[PDB]
Design a protein around this ligand. Structure first.
Ligand SMILES: CC(C)(C)c1nc(NCCc2c[nH]cn2)c2cc(C(N)=O)c(N)nc2n1
Ligand SMILES: NC(=O)c1ccc[n+]([C@@H]2O[C@H](COP(=O)(O)O)[C@@H](O)[C@H]2O)c1
Length: 312
């Protein structure tokens, strides 16, 4: 195979393999059998092995990692990553709704989402290319964990549309992976992680990306730092749009027109809790209309337009 032929073929393979990866990791619904992906993946590895200059950032072979950092550079969030206000009872939730109606002056719809137990992350894309991955940190300054996030399979290295946007969401470790990891640590005389949240946080703190690539971390994106590039006008629309551009979103969301529907949602997933492949510590209730979120604003700690109902 000539360099000229390999150059063209490599792009074809990346394109095809990344589409399969999108279906498998982002949609959780593969179209082809694994052996189909494996054969094409092997073909690409052979090409890259022969002509290493053909290796690119969006090549699926880079998911295994390789870089080892000495430490993490600071990662500023010019648009702050606020925290969430907490609610602990049906009372707190209805009180929240009352305060929201009092401020807005009319009934308001809420986009309800599961509160994934993990770590909040921020992903920056420029012209569709993944350029920065960061932890929330203290809200205004986090850690630059770009290299580690390159190994997180559900994180796209190149979006289909060449858009420049910074999306945010949760990075977590599914229950099964958490269990297996702790067994592995027990086998190697290491301290186990107390919970999936800690396992995810500890994994993203590792400096050797090759180790992180093996931690089986996953994601659920739920917001955008700057809605400039995007068209969504409500949170529910934002979730659909995040999915449209290539990110993994949680399918269990629900738009509720009343606080009673909100409470019904909470009860529904409070029972379905144990059945999910990931842990959740509550429900996040968000004023759906962005125009109303803007009107409500933020306290110093968090937005006034959202509240997290924490499971007892
Ligand atoms: C954007 C707001 C403030 C309303 C928000 N903050 C969360 N956490 C605090 C940090 C942060 C700032 N920017 C991105 N994250 C959320 C965590 C979850 C979850 N744990 O699943 C969720 N579904 N939604 C969340 N929504
Ligand atoms: N069927 C598919 O579309 C698809 C896509 C990505 C990974 N996989 C499988 O995931 C596993 C890990 O492969 P990667 O580390 O290359 O992501 C393999 O068993 C592979 O076959 C399958």
């Amino acid at each position: 195979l000539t360099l000229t032929a390999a150059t063209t073929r490599a792009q074809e393979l990346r394109k095809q393999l990344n589409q399969y990866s999108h279906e498998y990791y982002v949609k959780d619904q593969p179209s082809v059998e694994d052996y189909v992906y494996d054969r094409l993946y092997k073909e690409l590895v052979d090409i890259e092995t022969e002509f290493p200059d053909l290796i690119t950032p969006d090549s699926p072979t880079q998911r295994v990692g390789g870089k080892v950092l000495s430490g993490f550079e600071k990662a500023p969030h010019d648009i702050p990553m606020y925290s969430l206000n907490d609610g602990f009872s049906k009372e707190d939730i209805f009180a929240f709704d009352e305060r929201v109606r009092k401020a807005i002056g009319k009934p308001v719809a809420y986009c309800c989402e599961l509160k994934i137990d993990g770590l909040a992350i921020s992903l920056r894309y420029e012209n569709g290319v993944f350029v920065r991955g960061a932890t929330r940190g203290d809200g205004t300054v986090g850690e630059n964990i770009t290299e580690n996030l390159r190994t997180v399979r559900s994180v796209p290295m190149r979006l289909t549309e060449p858009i420049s946007v910074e999306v945010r969401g949760e990075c977590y470790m599914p229950k099964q992976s958490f269990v297996a990891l702790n067994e592995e640590r027990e086998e190697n005389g290491q301290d186990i992680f107390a919970n999936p949240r800690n396992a995810a946080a500890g994994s993203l703190r590792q400096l050797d990306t090759k180790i992180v690539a093996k931690r089986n971390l996953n994601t659920f994106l739920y917001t955008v730092a700057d809605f400039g590039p995007m068209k969504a006008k409500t949170q529910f629309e934002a979730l659909e749009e995040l999915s449209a551009i290539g990110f993994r979103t949680n399918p269990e969301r629900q738009l509720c027109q009343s606080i009673d529907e909100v409470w019904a949602y909470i009860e529904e997933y409070h029972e379905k809790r144990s059945t999910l492949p990931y842990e959740i510590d509550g429900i996040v209730i968000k004023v759906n209309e962005f125009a109303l979120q803007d009107e409500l604003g933020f306290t110093v700690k968090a937005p006034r337009w959202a509240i997290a109902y924490k499971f007892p």
